[PDB]
């Protein structure tokens, strides 16, 4: 299960995961192969905030999906 | 220029523009950002995902 995500830069880093992995674990995924802080990385899917308290499943997350990495207070 | 909005992202920050279902956006245009887009909706200017926002030309 392979998941899209947009970063604001311009980069579709696609990520492994499971329906039964936490936001909190995607964090550290992202932490570990693009080096952006979990307190500094926001996760937006289909118009909701993604808790680091829930599980893809709870968000119903599928495969082939497309999250939304987007800054505290974006200025640009 | 002018996009339709199909989903319900709420603004998330003060640069951030709450777009719903059937919100049209005046003036969209596509930002340096991948996927965040600019426009004025609810007289408010904002910033918007692009997964969000449908153009309607």
Do not use: C
């Not at chain 2, 996927?35 to 408010?44: F, I, M, Q, S, T």
């Amino acid at each position: 299960m392979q998941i899209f995500v947009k970063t604001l830069t311009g980069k579709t880093i696609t990520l492994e995961v499971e329906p039964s992995d936490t936001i909190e674990n995607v964090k550290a995924k992202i932490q570990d192969k693009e080096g952006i802080p979990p307190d500094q990385q926001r996760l937006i899917f289909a118009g909701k905030q993604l808790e680091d308290g829930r599980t893809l499943s709870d968000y119903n997350i599928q495969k082939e999906s497309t999250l939304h990495l987007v800054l505290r207070l974006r200025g640009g | 220029v002018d996009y339709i909005v199909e989903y319900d992202y709420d603004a998330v920050h003060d640069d951030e523009l709450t777009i719903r279902v059937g919100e049209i956006i005046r003036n969209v245009k596509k930002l340096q950002e991948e996927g965040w887009l600019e426009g004025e909706l609810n007289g408010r200017r904002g910033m918007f995902p692009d997964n969000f926002v449908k153009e309607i030309k």
